[PDB]
RNA sequence: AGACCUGAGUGUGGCAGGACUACCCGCCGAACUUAAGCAUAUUACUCAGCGGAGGAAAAGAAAACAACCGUGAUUCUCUCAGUGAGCGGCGAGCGAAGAGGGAACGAACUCGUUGCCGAAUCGGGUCUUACAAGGCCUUGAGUUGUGGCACAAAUAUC
RNA sequence: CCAAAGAAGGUGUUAGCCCAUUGAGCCAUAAACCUGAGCGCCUCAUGAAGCGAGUAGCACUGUUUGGGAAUGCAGUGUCAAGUUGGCAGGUAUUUGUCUGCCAAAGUUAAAUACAGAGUAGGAAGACCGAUAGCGAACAAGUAGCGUGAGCGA
């Protein structure tokens, strides 16, 4: 190809254009806003039928999985059957009152279990059950201490502690494996 | 448990006894039609595990499937085009023999609906699968809470789309995620996700 | 996509003493042997058939959209631009014309008329009203029959208070929280004649911000 | 009682600090604990049907004293050593109990 | 805007600027990148040296998350400090804490007379970045 | 004599059969084309052929990701990413996945097995305003097992 | 002169006022549908042990994939474990730990597709304007052509 231009990698070889011959895998979003007004109209109608039940279920605060996202926190799926036991709620019941439950969650920290528990509690307070069986029956400043730690040398020493762990023990044996 | 002593026995197939019993049966089946009904299945613990409860509207048919690789049905063995496709007596098909054994009952008997099949005998020639069917029109079934889903029209021919357990295997659906990303929910669905050319309204 | 295509047409080729374009195959009809599959052929394809995946909608920088409306208002406060942008503006008492907040209280429309005649705006809405004609063009047949000149938009801060003006020919109600260029500078030309209601006119300092804050 | 992680990002017990809860007992935990009933059931059905033909021959390799062959023959016909080393180890004790 | 296109100035030229002798035709050189080693060799070995061959060891299944180090310079620690924290800072005094893994960065590099002294919470540090902060009256408290 | 098992004939009650096929789901499945030739490759797991269904279909309730302060059915969108992945006469070309922002979401359940029960089951007649999720009856099916109770959202069955 | 109605259709010329529309509301109503799971009535219900076998694997072959000493699948051969078990953790082997998870049975709504479907409806378009736009503004998949598949104004 002619000139200094970049080497085109556009992948259009497969049949996509719907040429008078063929059909062709073209997806077009011209309906985007009409489906924007539709998803809303259907959140309202369900809000109008669900009344007076809160539109979306209660769900936990959850840590993001990888080392890129540890700093970040979002809303996971369910509350554990453990975290619900702490707040006193058994599942199969909290299921009906609009607390989203999932049996698979490991709660492998306490500091993570709490944040969901006091997230349960402040929900239970504001919760108004309506009477079920009958209307009448009514069942019940940065400082600086240690001047100089030479921080880096402490990061390597622990970093190169693992990196060489394999070679360092092998040497450590075949060195003393002699006699 | 009774199911255990019986099930741990079928798990020694190569033993002298389960070689001998199996041998007489291969003989007897060899002399019978491709599709033949039994009053009750020959592996009653396996038919139940696969869903056969003894009630009205529960059928078990044995089937024959001739075995071996697939010879392409091209005239005089002559294939055109470029040589990559030139082979015959070389491809292995894709559907199982079993997924065929369920589809053999697929058009021959129209009223029935198929649940699952299971391996029975194996020879140097045929291979037998007993297919468990069910009736959409049986009264003991519609009023049964557990199988009355089969009466729905969505399940009408569920063997012909590969929705049974034999059909779920060859579609690659046993391995869930990451062993199959590209074939789920189905190859044609994942192929169409990846191969669309999508135009965002605002570019 | 199939337009100007469905035919069995092939080309006769050389040796037939005729052009080499493809020709319809068959017999006994008026179009037997006629040309096909080309933009030149009567009824062939169009040259490069139009598509739905044309780029219809342009992005705009969020900032420039703000800059543009802001910049479009500073032209609404200048009587000289508004003069030449076309509005009469002869008897208008003052450039950012401003009116009371009670304007939202009208209910009958007959009263909102004598309002417009009181702040003099009835002279412009008679420029819109006397300019209504049937189009010159094919647009008549598309669903656009009539052309009107653009009028004296009126800006009411809440959605409420619309009524008392709705049937006025050529006046454009607008909320303050949502202001769009297309009505502030229709045609790209800047300095529409605007009428700000008192509670609306106050909102600006806290909506569009100011220098330094 | 798992060890706590050190706030450093490397390399022994790395990672930001929380208190770590022990693993909870799960229904899957019974997979490791021995099955006393099957080993009794798989005993009869074994005694019942006699010996598999693959098991016949590895039975004999042990008699002669060839061992590594009794291993190799099982790998070929099984495909894993942990499948095979659970086999001749099952066969070495088949000669034990008979005498 | 098809009214500004070069086609619209070329009505009447009959050749549309593609030439009378060598005509426009279809594909002169092969379609696309075709001809890399052969009849385009001068172009790909002039403007694009290195396009051909294999290099380096092979990493299957590359997930970019476990390797994430946006870094930053000492020179650039200002914009992680709001105004009025940077106004009050001194060596030995009280000075603002700058967190990185919350600010979207990981390593702390060298390259500058740190402008505003700080205590910076950083996953990774470097040798010469360590000294300057430690020397200029800040500190480095590493996190994970 | 009679029973059981296996297999026939007839009556009684019903169903499958073709159409539609844009989308969807199984199989079968090319070449033109690109590589400036052409054979692997590409076009393409596409057109054509065969089978099947819905108002969506398919998927789905972890033998899943990750290696983390850890996420939590399926589908879908943005982005990951036309990729310092990877595949490739390592040429032409091909090309994903987890994470993240979101749509949705009352979202989950029952069989087999095991343990305790052991015909409590199903059909057919009839009766109750009723082809009752009912009462009665019934060698008719069914013990070669229908059904009830509990399995981690658990932690006694009248 | 009307405007909570300026709506864009009709009429012998260019219509807010010649007509129809334009809008709060009115009557009629198989079942379903929706509402203190709408509300009464008779009967009817109801708060130690194991966990899926010609299966998973493995070899050969063929196929498909970004999946590389093999991602998935198929044919044939071979064929498990469950007594610290099994699979996955993207370089094969052997060995020790470590993390997740429990395959070989099933049902399941929404978010998703309509790329040459259909039904009963409604909105329109910076589009074409009778050699254009569907092949078809019209007694058009008609007249006409071919033995026929088909062709087709």
């Amino acid at each position: 190809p002619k000139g200094n231009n970049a080497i085109p990698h556009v992948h259009q070889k497969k049949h996509w254009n719907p040429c008078s011959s063929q059909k062709g895998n073209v997806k077009v979003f011209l309906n985007q806003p009409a489906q924007k007004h539709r998803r809303r109209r259907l959140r309202l109608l369900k809000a109008k039928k669900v009344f007076p039940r809160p539109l979306k279920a209660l769900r936990p605060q959850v840590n993001c999985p990888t080392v890129r996202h540890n700093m970040k926190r979002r809303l996971g799926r369910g509350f554990s059957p453990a975290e619900l036991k702490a707040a006193g709620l058994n599942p199969q019941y909290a299921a009906t009152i609009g607390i989203r439950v999932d049996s698979r969650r490991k709660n492998k920290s306490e500091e993570g279990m709490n944040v969901n528990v006091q997230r349960l509690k402040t929900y239970m307070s504001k919760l108004v059950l309506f009477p079920m069986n009958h209307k009448k029956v009514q069942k019940g400043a940065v400082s600086a201490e240690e001047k100089s730690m030479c921080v880096y040398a402490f990061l390597k020493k622990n970093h190169s502690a693992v990196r060489f762990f394999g070679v360092r023990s092998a040497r450590a044996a075949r060195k003393e494996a002699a006699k | 448990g009774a199911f255990m002593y019986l099930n741990e026995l079928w798990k020694k197939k190569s033993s002298d006894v389960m070689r001998f019993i199996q041998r007489i049966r291969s003989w007897e089946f060899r002399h019978q039609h491709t599709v033949v009904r039994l009053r009750r299945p020959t592996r009653p613990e396996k038919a139940r595990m696969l869903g056969y409860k003894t009630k009205q509207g529960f059928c078990v048919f044995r089937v024959r499937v001739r075995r071996g690789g697939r010879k392409r049905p091209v005239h005089k063995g002559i294939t055109y085009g470029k040589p990559k496709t030139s082979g015959v007596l070389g491809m292995k098909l894709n559907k199982n023999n079993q997924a065929v054994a369920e589809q053999r009952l697929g058009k021959r008997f129209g009223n029935l609906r198929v649940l699952n099949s299971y391996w029975v005998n194996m020879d140097s020639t045929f291979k037998w699968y007993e297919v468990i069917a069910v009736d959409p029109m049986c009264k003991t079934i519609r009023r049964d809470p557990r199988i009355n889903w089969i009466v729905n029209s969505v399940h009408k021919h569920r063997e012909q789309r590969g929705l049974t357990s034999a059909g779920r295997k060859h579609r690659g659906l046993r391995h869930k995620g990451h062993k199959a990303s590209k074939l789920r929910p189905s190859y044609r669905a994942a192929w169409r996700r990846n191969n669309r050319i999508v135009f965002l309204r605002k570019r | 996509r199939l337009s100007g295509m469905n035919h069995s047409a092939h080309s006769w080729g050389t040796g037939r003493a005729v052009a080499r374009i493809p020709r319809i195959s068959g017999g006994g009809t008026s179009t037997s042997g006629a040309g096909a599959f080309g933009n030149m052929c009567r009824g062939g394809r169009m040259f490069a058939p139009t598509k739905i995946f044309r780029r219809w909608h342009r992005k705009i920088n969020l900032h420039q959209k703000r800059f543009a409306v802001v910049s479009a208002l500073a032209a609404s406060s200048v009587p000289s631009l508004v003069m030449s942008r076309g509005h009469r503006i002869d008897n208008v008492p003052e450039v950012p014309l401003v009116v009371e907040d009670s304007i939202q209280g009208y209910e009958k429309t007959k009263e909102a008329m004598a309002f417009l005649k009181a702040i003099a705006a009835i002279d412009d809405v008679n420029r819109v009203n006397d300019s209504r004609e049937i189009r010159a063009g094919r647009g008549k047949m598309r669903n656009r029959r009539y052309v009107a000149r653009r009028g004296p938009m009126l800006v009411m801060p809440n959605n409420k208070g619309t009524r008392a003006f709705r049937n006025i020919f050529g006046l454009d109600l607008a909320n303050v929280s949502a202001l769009n260029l297309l009505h502030l500078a229709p045609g790209g030309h800047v300095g529409r004649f605007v009428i700000w209601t008192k509670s609306a006119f106050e909102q600006l300092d806290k909506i569009f911000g100011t220098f330094t804050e | 009682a798992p060890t706590p992680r050190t706030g450093i990002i490397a390399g022994f017990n790395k990672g930001h600090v929380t208190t770590r809860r022990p693993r909870q007992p799960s229904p899957n935990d019974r997979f490791a604990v021995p099955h006393k009933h099957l080993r009794a059931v798989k005993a009869i059905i074994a005694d019942l049907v006699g010996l598999s033909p693959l098991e016949k021959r590895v039975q004999e390799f042990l008699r002669v004293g060839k061992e590594k062959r009794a291993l190799k023959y099982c790998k070929k016909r099984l495909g894993d050593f942990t499948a095979a080393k659970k086999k001749r180890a099952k066969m070495e004790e088949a000669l034990r109990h008979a005498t | 805007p098809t009214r500004f296109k070069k086609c619209r100035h070329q009505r009447g030229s009959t050749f549309c600027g593609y030439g009378r002798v060598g005509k426009h035709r279809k594909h002169e050189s092969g379609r696309g990148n075709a001809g890399g080693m052969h009849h385009h060799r001068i172009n790909f070995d002039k403007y694009h040296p290195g396009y051909f061959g294999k290099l380096g060891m092979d990493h299957y299944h590359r997930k970019k998350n476990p390797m994430w180090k946006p870094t930053i310079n000492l020179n650039n620690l200002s914009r992680l400090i709001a105004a009025e924290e940077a106004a009050k800072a001194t060596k030995g005094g009280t000075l603002p804490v700058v967190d990185l893994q919350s600010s979207g960065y990981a390593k702390l590099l060298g390259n500058g007379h740190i402008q505003v002294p700080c205590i910076v919470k950083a996953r990774y540090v470097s040798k010469l970045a360590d000294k300057k902060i430690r020397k200029a009256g800040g500190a480095v408290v590493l996190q994970a």
Side-chain angles (χ1 to χ4, degrees):
Chain A
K2 192 172 184 177
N4 189 28
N5 296 333
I7 290 172
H9 290 292
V10 297
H11 297 66
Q12 294 180 336
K13 300 298 181 64
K14 292 180 182 177
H15 292 161
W16 59 270
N17 190 39
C19 46
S20 63
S21 178
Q22 292 180 335
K23 295 180 293 186
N25 284 336
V26 172
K27 187 170 184 175
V28 180
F29 285 161
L30 294 172
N31 70 346
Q32 187 185 6
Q35 295 295 100
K36 186 181 295 176
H37 180 67
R38 181 182 180 274
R39 281 185 300 279
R40 190 171 192 170
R41 186 181 67 86
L42 266 64
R43 285 191 293 268
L44 299 176
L45 291 180
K46 187 180 83 174
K48 185 180 172 64
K49 288 190 291 292
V50 74
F51 186 86
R53 186 169 65 253
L55 177 63
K56 296 183 182 300
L58 176 69
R59 66 172 63 195
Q61 180 168 352
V62 167
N63 289 333
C64 297
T66 59
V67 64
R68 182 186 183 176
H69 299 156
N70 282 137
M71 58 197 76
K72 296 291 187 294
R73 287 171 179 76
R74 64 179 180 87
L75 275 62
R77 187 179 188 271
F79 291 99
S80 298
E83 300 175 354
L84 294 176
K85 184 177 178 181
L89 280 67
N90 69 334
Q92 291 179 335
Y93 173 71
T96 53
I97 67 170
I99 288 174
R100 185 180 292 278
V101 179
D102 57 352
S103 181
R104 63 186 82 88
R105 185 180 171 85
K106 293 302 182 185
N107 294 132
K108 51 188 66 182
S109 67
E110 288 183 350
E111 297 174 354
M113 181 175 74
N114 295 338
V115 177
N116 301 133
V117 174
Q118 287 83 3
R119 187 175 180 85
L120 280 167
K121 291 180 179 296
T122 62
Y123 174 77
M124 298 304 294
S125 67
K126 298 184 178 300
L127 175 63
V128 173
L129 289 180
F130 293 178
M132 184 66 180
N133 285 336
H134 190 273
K135 188 195 303 179
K136 291 189 292 292
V137 174
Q138 293 298 108
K139 186 176 181 179
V142 193
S143 73
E145 234 41 66
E146 58 197 349
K147 55 182 183 296
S148 61
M149 288 300 293
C150 185
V151 182
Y152 178 74
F154 178 79
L155 195 147
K156 291 296 284 186
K157 180 174 172 290
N158 282 278
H159 179 66
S160 67
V162 164
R163 183 179 68 187
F164 293 97
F165 173 75
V167 300
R168 183 173 291 117
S169 68
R171 175 176 293 103
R174 60 185 289 269
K175 182 175 179 176
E176 189 181 3
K179 295 173 180 176
Chain B
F3 173 88
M4 290 187 287
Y5 298 98
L6 193 150
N7 190 32
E8 299 302 319
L9 196 147
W10 281 95
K11 292 166 65 179
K12 301 292 182 64
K13 297 187 177 77
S14 60
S15 62
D16 288 340
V17 183
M18 290 299 296
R19 183 184 294 275
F20 175 80
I21 292 172
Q22 183 179 353
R23 173 181 176 170
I24 293 173
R25 291 183 181 176
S26 69
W27 180 87
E28 186 177 5
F29 303 172
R30 182 180 295 109
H31 298 295
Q32 294 179 338
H33 298 80
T34 59
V35 172
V36 54
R37 184 174 188 267
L38 281 64
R39 186 177 70 184
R40 58 175 63 92
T42 55
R43 294 175 63 184
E45 92 291 6
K46 188 64 169 60
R48 190 163 297 106
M49 253 186 51
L50 277 204
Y52 168 80
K53 297 183 182 303
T54 64
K55 298 180 69 64
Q56 296 186 339
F58 279 91
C59 302
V60 284
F61 295 159
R62 187 180 301 114
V63 179
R64 274 195 282 100
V65 170
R66 281 186 176 273
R67 73 170 54 199
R70 175 177 182 270
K71 184 175 179 178
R72 291 175 60 179
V74 63
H75 184 274
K76 191 178 292 296
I78 297 171
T79 57
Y80 306 94
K82 56 191 67 178
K84 68 183 74 179
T85 62
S86 63
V88 176
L89 359 130
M91 311 297 179
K92 301 297 185 293
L93 182 69
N94 286 293
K95 293 193 295 186
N96 308 129
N97 284 337
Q98 182 177 355
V100 173
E102 294 175 351
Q103 295 173 341
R104 295 291 177 81
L105 325 188
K107 295 177 295 297
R108 184 188 291 267
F109 298 149
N111 55 347
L112 304 181
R113 294 187 175 180
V114 175
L115 292 177
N116 287 283
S117 59
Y118 57 91
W119 182 99
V120 178
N121 284 334
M122 173 176 73
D123 292 349
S124 56
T125 59
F126 301 106
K127 186 188 290 180
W128 288 274
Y129 292 98
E130 292 180 357
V131 176
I132 300 166
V134 68
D135 304 351
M137 293 300 296
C138 190
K139 293 178 73 68
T140 197
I141 291 168
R142 293 191 165 185
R143 289 178 294 186
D144 181 354
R146 286 181 289 277
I147 298 178
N148 62 34
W149 56 274
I150 200 66
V151 178
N152 291 284
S153 65
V154 176
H155 302 285
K156 193 180 293 177
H157 286 286
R158 55 175 298 169
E159 75 289 6
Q160 301 299 103
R161 290 169 294 183
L163 303 176
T164 61
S165 178
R168 297 184 72 255
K169 181 175 171 58
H170 70 274
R171 300 192 298 115
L173 256 55
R174 296 198 186 286
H175 288 87
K176 293 183 76 71
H178 153 272
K179 303 295 280 189
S181 67
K182 301 180 76 68
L183 62 86
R184 297 184 68 90
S186 61
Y187 288 97
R188 177 59 163 165
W191 182 90
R192 188 180 287 271
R193 286 187 289 101
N194 290 335
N195 288 125
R196 298 183 187 93
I197 281 92
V198 58
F199 290 145
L200 293 175
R201 190 189 62 187
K202 287 183 175 296
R203 289 165 292 179
Chain C
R1 65 185 187 92
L2 269 61
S3 292
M5 290 300 292
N6 294 129
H7 291 295
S8 63
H10 298 283
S11 176
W12 293 358
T14 61
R16 302 275 291 177
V18 76
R20 288 181 295 177
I21 68 170
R23 295 183 181 273
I24 296 167
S25 66
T29 58
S30 181
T31 58
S32 295
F37 292 174
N39 45 342
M40 63 202 88
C41 296
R42 199 204 110 207
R45 290 177 297 103
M46 59 173 283
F47 153 58
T50 54
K51 296 290 182 61
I52 61 172
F53 52 87
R54 292 174 61 92
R55 182 185 177 177
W56 296 104
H57 307 286
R58 303 292 191 274
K59 295 166 60 178
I60 304 173
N61 290 337
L62 177 142
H63 195 285
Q64 291 181 337
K65 286 193 293 186
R66 290 173 178 171
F67 195 111
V69 174
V70 166
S71 64
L73 286 180
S76 296
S77 67
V78 179
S80 66
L81 299 175
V82 180
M83 280 293 293
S84 69
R85 199 258 167 231
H87 303 285
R88 291 287 180 262
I89 309 305
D90 297 334
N91 306 139
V92 169
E94 180 170 0
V95 190
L97 181 63
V98 184
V99 292
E100 303 179 356
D101 286 339
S102 68
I103 199 65
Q104 299 176 338
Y106 289 148
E107 289 180 351
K108 301 299 287 186
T109 201
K110 186 173 184 179
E111 56 187 345
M113 292 295 175
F115 163 71
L116 293 175
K117 185 178 75 181
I119 57 174
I122 197 70
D123 190 2
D124 185 72
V125 69
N126 290 344
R127 185 182 69 91
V128 175
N129 192 29
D130 290 345
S131 70
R132 185 173 183 268
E133 301 298 321
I134 284 174
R135 291 198 178 182
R138 179 56 53 79
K140 296 180 293 295
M141 292 174 57
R142 320 293 176 85
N143 310 332
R144 299 177 289 269
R145 295 300 306 275
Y146 296 94
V147 168
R149 302 292 171 270
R150 188 63 71 179
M153 73 176 285
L154 170 65
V155 185
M156 294 185 291
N158 282 341
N159 54 341
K160 296 293 183 290
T162 53
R163 284 216 284 96
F165 299 98
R166 186 60 62 87
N167 277 293
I168 296 171
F169 193 22
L171 182 143
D172 285 346
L173 308 172
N175 182 338
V176 177
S177 62
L179 289 169
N180 61 345
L181 287 172
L182 311 185
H183 304 292
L184 286 177
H189 301 164
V190 292
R192 182 198 282 271
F193 160 66
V194 180
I195 297 168
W196 294 94
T197 59
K198 175 61 160 56
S199 178
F201 191 89
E202 298 169 351
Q203 292 293 316
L204 270 62
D205 175 68
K206 293 180 294 184
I207 285 176
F208 296 162
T210 57
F211 301 152
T212 311
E213 65 186 344
Chain D
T3 59
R5 294 180 177 88
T6 59
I8 300 99
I9 192 169
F12 276 156
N13 293 281
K14 54 180 290 180
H16 178 281
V17 180
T18 58
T19 61
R20 294 178 63 190
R21 289 169 55 83
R23 65 178 179 85
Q24 298 299 100
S26 296
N28 302 131
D29 294 341
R30 186 169 297 100
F31 287 144
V33 65
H35 298 81
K36 290 180 178 177
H37 200 282
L38 283 180
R39 179 59 183 164
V41 172
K42 294 173 73 71
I44 298 168
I45 304 298
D47 188 8
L48 190 155
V49 302
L51 270 63
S52 178
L54 177 145
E55 180 179 0
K56 295 295 286 185
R57 182 177 293 175
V58 173
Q59 186 79 266
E60 298 182 358
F61 287 160
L62 297 175
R63 292 179 182 171
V64 180
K66 294 184 174 76
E67 288 181 347
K68 183 179 293 296
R69 292 296 300 179
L71 182 67
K72 293 192 173 81
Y73 182 78
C74 291
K75 176 179 177 289
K76 183 182 178 182
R77 297 170 70 90
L78 294 175
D80 291 345
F81 280 151
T82 55
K85 288 192 295 184
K86 290 181 181 297
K87 187 67 168 176
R88 66 168 181 180
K90 183 169 180 290
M91 297 308 296
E92 285 171 343
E93 297 182 355
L95 297 173
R96 180 180 296 177
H97 294 83
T99 58
Chain E
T2 63
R3 67 190 182 282
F4 299 105
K5 294 293 181 66
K6 186 176 170 59
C7 173
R8 187 54 53 176
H9 184 273
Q10 289 178 333
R11 295 301 190 201
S13 68
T14 75
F15 302 142
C16 298
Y18 288 99
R20 192 185 292 272
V21 174
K23 304 181 176 74
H24 186 193
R25 302 303 191 196
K26 299 295 288 185
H27 293 83
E28 303 297 322
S29 57
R31 285 188 177 178
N33 291 334
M37 292 299 298
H38 301 289
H39 60 288
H40 293 165
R41 193 184 189 89
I42 297 174
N43 190 342
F44 292 178
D45 285 346
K46 187 177 182 180
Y47 299 136
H48 297 285
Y51 182 78
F52 289 140
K54 288 182 177 178
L55 175 61
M57 61 181 75
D58 197 9
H59 196 290
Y60 306 139
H61 184 199
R62 180 178 63 87
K63 54 182 72 175
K64 279 186 173 180
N65 289 338
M67 181 71 75
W68 181 82
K69 294 179 182 175
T71 70
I72 189 167
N73 286 339
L74 293 180
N75 193 20
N76 273 338
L77 297 168
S78 179
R79 60 189 186 90
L80 298 184
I81 299 169
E84 288 185 352
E85 288 84 0
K88 58 177 294 180
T90 185
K91 176 169 73 179
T94 63
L95 41 79
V97 169
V98 177
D99 185 3
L100 291 180
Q101 78 181 20
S102 292
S103 300
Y105 298 90
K107 201 176 183 69
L108 182 139
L109 304 173
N111 218 17
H113 182 62
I114 176 173
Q115 291 295 314
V116 176
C118 300
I119 291 171
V120 181
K121 293 177 67 64
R123 284 181 176 172
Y124 293 92
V125 184
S126 63
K127 292 181 298 180
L128 187 144
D130 185 5
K131 289 180 67 67
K132 287 175 177 174
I133 287 177
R134 173 179 175 271
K135 186 183 291 180
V140 179
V141 175
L142 53 79
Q143 56 182 11

